[PDB]
Amino acid sequence: AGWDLSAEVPAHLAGRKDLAGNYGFDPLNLGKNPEALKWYQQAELQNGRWAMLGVAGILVQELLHSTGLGGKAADVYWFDAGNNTFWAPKETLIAISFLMFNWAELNRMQDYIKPGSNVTDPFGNKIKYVELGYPGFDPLSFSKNNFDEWKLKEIKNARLAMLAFLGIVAQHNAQPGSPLEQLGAHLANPWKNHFINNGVSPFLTDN
Amino acid sequence: MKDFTTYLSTAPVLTLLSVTVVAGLLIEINRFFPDALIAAF
Amino acid sequence: DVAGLTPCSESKAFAKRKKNEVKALNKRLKNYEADSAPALALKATIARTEARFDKYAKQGLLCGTDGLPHLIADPGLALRYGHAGDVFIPTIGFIYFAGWLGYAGSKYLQAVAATAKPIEKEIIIDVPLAWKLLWEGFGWPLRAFAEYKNGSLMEDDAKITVSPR
Amino acid sequence: ATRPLWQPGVEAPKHLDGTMPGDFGFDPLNLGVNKEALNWYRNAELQNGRWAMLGVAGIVIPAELTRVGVLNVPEWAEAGKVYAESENAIPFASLLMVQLFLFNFVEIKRWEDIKKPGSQAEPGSFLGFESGFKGTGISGYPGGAFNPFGLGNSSKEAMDDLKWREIRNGRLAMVAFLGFLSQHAATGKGPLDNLADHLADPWGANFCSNGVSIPSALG
Amino acid sequence: KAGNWLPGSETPAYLENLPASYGFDPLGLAAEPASLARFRESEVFHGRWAMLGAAGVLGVEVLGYGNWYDAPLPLVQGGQATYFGASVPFDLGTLAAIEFAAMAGAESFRGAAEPEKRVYPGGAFDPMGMSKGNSKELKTKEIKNGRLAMLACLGFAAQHAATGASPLEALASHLANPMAVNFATNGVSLPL
Numbered sequence: 001a002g003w004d005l006s007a008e009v010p011a012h013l014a015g016r017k018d019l020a021g022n023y024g025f026d027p028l029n030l031g032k033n034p035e036a037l038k039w040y041q042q043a044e045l046q047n048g049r050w051a052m053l054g055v056a057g058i059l060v061q062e063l064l065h066s067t068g069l070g071g072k073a074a075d076v077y078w079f080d081a082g083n084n085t086f087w088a089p090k091e092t093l094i095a096i097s098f099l100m101f102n103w104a105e106l107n108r109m110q111d112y113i114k115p116g117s118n119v120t121d122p123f124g125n126k127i128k129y130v131e132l133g134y135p136g137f138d139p140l141s142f143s144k145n146n147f148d149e150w151k152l153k154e155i156k157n158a159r160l161a162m163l164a165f166l167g168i169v170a171q172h173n174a175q176p177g178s179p180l181e182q183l184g185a186h187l188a189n190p191w192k193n194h195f196i197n198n199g200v201s202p203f204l205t206d207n
Numbered sequence: 208m209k210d211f212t213t214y215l216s217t218a219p220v221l222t223l224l225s226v227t228v229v230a231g232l233l234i235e236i237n238r239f240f241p242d243a244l245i246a247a248f
Numbered sequence: 249d250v251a252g253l254t255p256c257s258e259s260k261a262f263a264k265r266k267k268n269e270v271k272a273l274n275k276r277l278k279n280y281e282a283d284s285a286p287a288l289a290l291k292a293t294i295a296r297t298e299a300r301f302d303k304y305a306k307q308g309l310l311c312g313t314d315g316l317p318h319l320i321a322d323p324g325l326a327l328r329y330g331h332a333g334d335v336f337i338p339t340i341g342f343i344y345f346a347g348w349l350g351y352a353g354s355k356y357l358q359a360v361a362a363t364a365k366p367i368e369k370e371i372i373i374d375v376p377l378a379w380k381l382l383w384e385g386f387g388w389p390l391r392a393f394a395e396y397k398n399g400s401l402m403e404d405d406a407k408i409t410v411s412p413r
Numbered sequence: 414a415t416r417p418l419w420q421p422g423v424e425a426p427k428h429l430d431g432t433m434p435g436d437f438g439f440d441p442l443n444l445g446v447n448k449e450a451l452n453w454y455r456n457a458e459l460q461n462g463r464w465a466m467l468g469v470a471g472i473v474i475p476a477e478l479t480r481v482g483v484l485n486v487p488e489w490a491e492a493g494k495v496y497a498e499s500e501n502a503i504p505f506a507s508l509l510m511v512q513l514f515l516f517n518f519v520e521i522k523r524w525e526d527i528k529k530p531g532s533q534a535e536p537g538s539f540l541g542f543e544s545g546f547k548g549t550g551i552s553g554y555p556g557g558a559f560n561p562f563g564l565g566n567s568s569k570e571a572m573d574d575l576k577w578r579e580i581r582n583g584r585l586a587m588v589a590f591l592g593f594l595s596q597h598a599a600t601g602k603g604p605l606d607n608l609a610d611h612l613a614d615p616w617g618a619n620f621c622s623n624g625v626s627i628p629s630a631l632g
Numbered sequence: 633k634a635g636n637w638l639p640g641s642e643t644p645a646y647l648e649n650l651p652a653s654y655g656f657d658p659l660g661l662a663a664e665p666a667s668l669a670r671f672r673e674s675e676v677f678h679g680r681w682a683m684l685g686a687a688g689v690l691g692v693e694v695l696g697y698g699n700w701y702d703a704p705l706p707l708v709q710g711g712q713a714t715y716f717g718a719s720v721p722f723d724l725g726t727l728a729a730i731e732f733a734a735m736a737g738a739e740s741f742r743g744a745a746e747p748e749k750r751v752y753p754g755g756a757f758d759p760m761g762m763s764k765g766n767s768k769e770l771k772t773k774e775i776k777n778g779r780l781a782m783l784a785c786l787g788f789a790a791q792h793a794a795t796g797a798s799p800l801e802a803l804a805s806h807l808a809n810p811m812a813v814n815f816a817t818n819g820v821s822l823p824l
C-alpha cells in the first residue's frame with residue numbers, strides 16, 4: 001500500500017515491520033515463505049551494500065577520469081580498467097580475492113546459519129550482536145539513536161545504488177563513454193538524448 | 208442417436224471401419240513413402 | 249560385402265536391370281503424344297522407377313550374382329557391416345507394434361471381463377474404452393515387464409483348467 | 414491433492430496421490446498404476462534427470478563459454494572425435510570398458526539400494542565406509558557422504574521444497590537434451606548457433622524450414 | 633578437543649577424547665564405533681608413513697642425489713640404481729620380491745594384533761621409553777606432524793604433476809619470483 005496506494009500489502013509483508021524499507025512492494029510473492037524472506041533480506045542487504053560500494057567507486061573514479069586528478073591509473077574508462085598494469089597481474093589478484101572472500105563470506109555464512117554463534121575472534125575479542133543482517137560493526141556507534149531511521153536511510157540508499165548500477169551497465173551497453181559523460185550528453189539537449197533514440201532499446205524504431 | 212452410435216460400435220461395423228482406416232493409412236504411407244525396402248533412418 | 253555380395257551400387261547386373269526396366273517403359277512411351285494422360289502416367293512411372301533404383305543404390309543393399317537386393321538376418325554380422333536396417337531394425341519395429349496391439353486387446357479383455365455381461369462387451373465394443381486402452385498400449389514394453397517382474401502377467405496352472413490326461 | 418495439475422480440470426489418477434516430488438497428475442498412458450513399477454520409475458526418473466542435468470550443463474556451459482571467447486572447446490557432437498584423434502588418446506574400446514567397469518560397481522551398489530533401501534549399510538560390507546550408505550528412507554536420495562553441505566537437512570518441508578526444485582530442473586534438462594539431440598540431427602549446428610539463428614528470423618528459421626523435421630515428400 | 637575446525641559450530645559428539653581432535657567429521661564417516669576405531673589406526677599409520685616419506689623426499693634432494701620422482705628411473709634404462717653412490721646390483725624383479733616378502737611378513741605381524749597394539753605398540757617400538765610420561769600430548773604431537781606430512785606429500789605429488797620441477801626447485805622458483813610463479817600462473821591449477 002505504501003509502495004502503491006489503493007493496493008494491498010501482501011500479508012507476509014503486513015505485520016512484519018522489523019524489515020528495513022518495508023513498503024508492501026511484493027507483486028511476485030517471492031517472500032511468502034518465511035525462510036525465503038529471511039534469506040532474501042540478507043540477499044538484499046548484501047547486494048545493496050556491495051552496489052553502494054561499486055557505484056560510489058564507478059562515479060568517483062569516472063569523475064576523477066573526467067576532471068583529471070588521479071593520473072594514468074584513473075585516466076581510463078571504468079570498464080576498460082583491465083589494461084592498467086598494477087603491482088600484480090590479473091590472475092594472482094583473482095586468486096588472492098578468492099582466498100580472502102572465502103574467509104570473509106564463510107564467517108558471514110556461519111553467522112547466518114546460527115545467528116550469534118560467530119562473534120568471537122581467535123584472540124578472545126568479543127563483539128556485540130544485534131539483528132541478523134546487522135553485525136553491529138559500529139566503530140563510531142551511529143546506532144544508538146533512532147536506529148530504524150538509520151536502517152531506513154541505509155536501505156533506501158542501497159536500493160537507489162542497485163538501481164544506479166543496473167543503469168550503469170545498461171547504458172554502457174547502449175551508449176558509449178563514462179556514466180557522467182552520458183549524463184552530460186543527456187543534459188546537452190535533452191529532448192533528443194534519451195533512451196528512445198539509441199537504436200539499442202525500443203528496436204521498433206530504425207530496426 | 209444413442210442407438211445409432213451403439214450400432215456403430217457393433218463388431219461388424221467397427222471392425223470394417225478400423226480395417227478401412229488402417230488400410231487407408233497404409234495406402235497413404237505407401238503413396239508418400241513408396242518402395243521402402245529397409246528401415247533407412 | 250558380407251558373403252560374396254558386392255554392394256548394388258557396384259554390381260553391374262543391378263545397373264543392367266535398371267537399364268532394361270527403364271528401356272521397357274520407354275518403349276511403352278513411344279506410342280502417345282508426350283502430353284496426354286497416358287504419356288504423363290508413363291513418365292511418372294519412369295520417374296518412380298529411377299527414384300527407386302537410385303534409392304536402393306544409395307542405401308548400400310547387397311546384390312547377388314543376379315541384380316537383386318539381399319538382406320541379412322543376423323545381428324552382429326549385420327551390425328558390424330552396416331546392414332542393421334535390413335532385419336534387426338524392422339524386427340524391433342514390428343515386435344513393438346505387434347506388442348502394442350496385443351497388449352491393447354489383452355487389457356481390453358481384462359477390463360471388460362469384470363462387468364455385468366462380459367459376453368456382450370465383445371460383440372458390442374465400448375469404443376471410448378477401446379480407444380483409451382489403445383492409447384495406453386503404447387508403453388507396453390514397460391507395463392509388460394512390470395507385470396512380469398510383479399508376477400501378475402501370468403496365471404498359475406493350478407487355476408487353469410486342463411484335460412483328463 | 415488440491416495441487417495444480419498438468420491439465421486444469423482433468424483430475425489426477427487415483428494412484429498418483431500427491432506425495433511424490435514433481436507430482437502434477439501427469440500420466441496419460443497409465444504407466445505407473447503398479448506401485449512397485451511406480452517406485453522403479455521414480456528412481457529411473459531421478460537417474461535420468463541427474464545425468465541429463467550434468468550432460469546439459471557440460472554441453473551449454475562449455476558452448477556458451479566458447480562463444481564469448483574462453484576455453485574454445487569443440488561443439489558437443491564432434492567432441493568425441495576431437496579427443497579421439499589426439500596423440501596420447503586412449504582407444505575407444507579400452508576407454509569404454511574402463512568406464513563400464515567402474516560404473517558396474519557403482520550402479521550395482523545403487524541397485525542393491527533400490528531393492529531394500531538399507532541394504533548396503535550392513536556392517537562388514539566395506540572397510541568401515543558402509544555407514545555412509547544407510548540411505549534416507551527413500552530410494553534415490555542417499556545423503557550421508559552424498560550431500561556434503563547438508564542442504565535441506567533441516568526442516569523436512571525444506572527438503573521437500575528442494576526436491577521439487579531438483580525434479581523440475583531435471584525435467585527441464587531432459588527436455589532440453591532431447592532438444593539438443595534432435596536439433597543437431599536436423600541442423601548440423603550447435604545449440605547456441607540455433608538459438609542465435611532463430612532470433613534472427615523467427616518466422617523463417619525454425620523447425621518447418623530445416624527440411625528434416627517436416628518430411629520433404631509431403632511438401 | 634583443543635580445536636573447533638569451524639570456530640563456531642556443533643561438533644560430532646563421538647570426537648571428544650581423541651588425541652588432536654578438532655571435531656572434523658562433517659561427513660559422518662566414523663559415526664559407528666568400529667569405523668572410528670579402525671580410522672584412528674589408519675590415520676596414525678598414514679601419518680607415520682607420510683612423515684618418513686616427506687623426510688625422504690626432502691633428504692634425497694637437499695643432500696644432492698636427485699629428485700623423488702627420478703628415483704626409479706635408474707631401475708630400468710638398462711639397469712644400475714644409485715644409493716648414496718653404491719651400485720646395489722639388484723634388478724627390478726628382486727626388488728619387488730625382497731620388498732614384498734619384507735612388507736608381507738611385517739604387515740601381517742603388526743595387524744594380527746589387538747586394536748591398541750596395532751597402532752600404539754610399546755614393546756621394542758619405544759626404546760627410549762617416551763611412550764610413558766603423559767603420552768596424550770605426544771600423541772597429539774605425532775598426529776599433527778603426521779597431518780602436516782600428509783599434506784606435504786600430497787603437495788609434492790601435485791606440484792610435480794603440474795610444474796614438473798622439484799620441491800626445492802619449486803621453492804626456489806617461487807622465492808625468486810613470488811609474483812608470476814605461483815599455482816595461479818601455471819595454466820594447470822587455476823584455469824580462470
Ligand code: CLA
Nearest residue numbers: 349350351352353354355356357373377378379380381382
Ligand atoms: C488382443 C487379442 C489376442 C491376444 C492378446 C492374443 C495372444 C496370443 N495368441 Mg491369439 N487369437 C486371437 C486374439 C488374440 N490372441 C483371435 C481373435 C484369434 C482368432 C483368429 C486368435 C487365434 C489364435 C491362435 C490359433 C493362436 C493364438 C496364439 C496366441 C499366443 C501367441 C502369440 C501370437 O502370435 O498369436 C497369433 C495371433 C493371431 C493368430 C491373430 C491375432 C488376431 C488379431 C490380429 C488381434 C485381435 C485384436 C482385437 C480384435 C482388437 C481389440 C482391441 C481393443 C481396443 C478392442 C498369444 C499369447 C497361438 C498360441 O497357441 O499360443 C502360443 C495360436 O496358435 N491365437
Ligand SMILES: CC1=C[C@H](O)CC(C)(C)[C@H]1/C=C/C(C)=C/C=C/C(C)=C/C=C/C=C(C)/C=C/C=C(C)/C=C/C1=C(C)C[C@H](O)CC1(C)C
Nearest residue numbers: 440441442443461464465468471472489492587588590591
Ligand atoms: C512422463 C510420461 C508419463 C506419461 O504417462 C507417458 C509419457 C508421455 C511417455 C511420459 C513422458 C515421457 C518423456 C517426455 C520422456 C522423455 C525423456 C527424456 C528426454 C530423457 C532424456 C534423458 C537424457 C539424458 C539422461 C542425457 C544425458 C546426457 C549426457 C550424459 C550427455 C553427455 C555428453 C556430454 C556431456 C558432452 C559430450 O561432448 C557428448 C556427450 C557424451 C553426449
Ligand SMILES: CC(=O)/C=C/C=C(C)/C=C/[C@H]1[C@H](C)CCCC1(C)C
Nearest residue numbers: 736737738739740741742743744745
Ligand atoms: C590383497 C592381499 O593379498 C591380501 C591382503 C590381506 C590382508 C590385508 C589381511 C590382513 C590382516 C587381517 C585384516 C586379519 C588377519 C591377518 C592380517 C594380516 C592382520
Ligand SMILES: NCC(=O)NCC(=O)O
Nearest residue numbers: 540670673743744747750
Ligand atoms: N579381525 C581383524 C581386524 O579387526 N582387522 C582390522 C583392520 O583391517 O585393520
